Amino acid sequence: AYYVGYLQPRTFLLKYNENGTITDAVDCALDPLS
Amino acid sequence: LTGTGVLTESNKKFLPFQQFGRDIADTTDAVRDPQTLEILDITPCSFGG
Numbered sequence: 001a002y003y004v005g006y007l008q009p010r011t012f013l014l015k016y017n018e019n020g021t022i023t024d025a026v027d028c029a030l031d032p033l034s
Numbered sequence: 035l036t037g038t039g040v041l042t043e044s045n046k047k048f049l050p051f052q053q054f055g056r057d058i059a060d061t062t063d064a065v066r067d068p069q070t071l072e073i074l075d076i077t078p079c080s081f082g083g
């Protein structure tokens with residue numbers, strides 16, 4: 001099975017850990033709390 | 035990537051695709067050598083009043 005999606009220009013916040021890997025992100029447009 | 039400074043050995047790991055590293059205020063802290071898989075820190079040259 002396969003899936004398809006489309007990207008749009010948006011603003012994210014990304015978290016880096018000591019080793020330098022991405023571990024979490026936040027989407028500025030999702031809801032007022034984000 | 036160009037600049038001035040003192041190049042020293044370092045103890046920082048990296049991912050096979052990463053070239054450079056930064057401090058918070060967009061400051062180049064370290065560089066990876068192309069010829070060999072090594073990481074050098076950069077320190078400013080001494081100055082003062």
Ligand SMILES: *[C@@H]1O[C@H](CO)[C@@H](O[C@@H]2O[C@H](CO)[C@@H](O[C@@H]3O[C@H](CO)[C@@H](O)[C@H](O)[C@@H]3O)[C@H](O)[C@H]2NC(C)=O)[C@H](O)[C@H]1NC(C)=O
Pocket residue numbers: 017018019
């Ligand atoms: C970032 O990477 C470092 C280095 O790998 C992580 O520290 C290391 O974590 C392991 C546990 O996964 C510690 O145990 C070691 O596991 C290996 C593989 O089983 C084993 O061969 C060793 O004998 C040892 O038992 C390891 O001690 C530790 N390294 C040090 C120097 O203490 C670290 O956890 C990573 N940071 C993360 C994931 O946030």
Ligand SMILES: *[C@@H]1O[C@H](CO)[C@@H](O[C@@H]2O[C@H](CO)[C@@H](O[C@@H]3O[C@H](CO)[C@@H](O)[C@H](O)[C@@H]3O)[C@H](O)[C@H]2NC(C)=O)[C@H](O)[C@H]1NC(C)=O
Pocket residue numbers: 069070
């Ligand atoms: C291209 O880059 C490679 C590595 O990215 C360079 O290869 C390295 O060259 C050094 C010599 O300058 C090698 O050290 C010597 O090689 C022998 C081979 O038996 C080994 O016993 C010792 O390591 C010895 O000191 C090194 O092994 C070799 N490979 C690495 C570092 O992974 C290469 O010189 C660069 N230039 C060219 C024209 O290929």
